[PDB]
Amino acid sequence: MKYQQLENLECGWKWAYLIRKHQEGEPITKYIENSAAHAAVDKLIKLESEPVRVLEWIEQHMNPDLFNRMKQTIRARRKRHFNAEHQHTRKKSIDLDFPVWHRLSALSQRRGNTLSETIVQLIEDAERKEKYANQ
């Protein structure tokens, strides 16, 4: 663990995730019966201002499918929340045309390094040419 886990924040994150999934129409509950599922969802809604009880509601009515997605999404959210503090740790999203991305990904898999590292190497070779031109 590199990032401090805060209980009263991650609990709210989890509750918001459950509510978003439900309102999107997915079956967060493990219940096939309509009545029990509706009651469990209503109780989760009541749990809005008590994120602490959300862990118990998860252990009581959460669909067994969603544990992996849960542990993935909140983990990623924690990383992003702690990285957003400083610019130099942030990430920037860009879109690439299929040919360009294909060539770049092939090159990266060839060199066995991540996309950012490959871009660093390319721009660094270009900047080396520029530097030797400058000297």
Partner: protein, 49 residues
């Protein structure tokens, strides 16, 4: 010594990063201070404990 020049460039980029972080933090702090003119800052916010 072009390698030394590249080292200088790397240190320059690091220093740019740190200076930008510091200046942004200072600007945010100044904005907050101007926004707390309601006098809630003298003791209530700046708890030196």
């Amino acid at each position: 010594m072009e390698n030394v020049q590249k080292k200088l460039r790397k240190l320059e980029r690091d220093y740019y990063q740190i200076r930008e972080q510091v200046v942004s933090a200072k600007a945010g702090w100044c904005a907050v201070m101007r926004m707390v003119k309601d006098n809630g800052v003298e003791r209530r916010l700046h708890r030196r404990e």
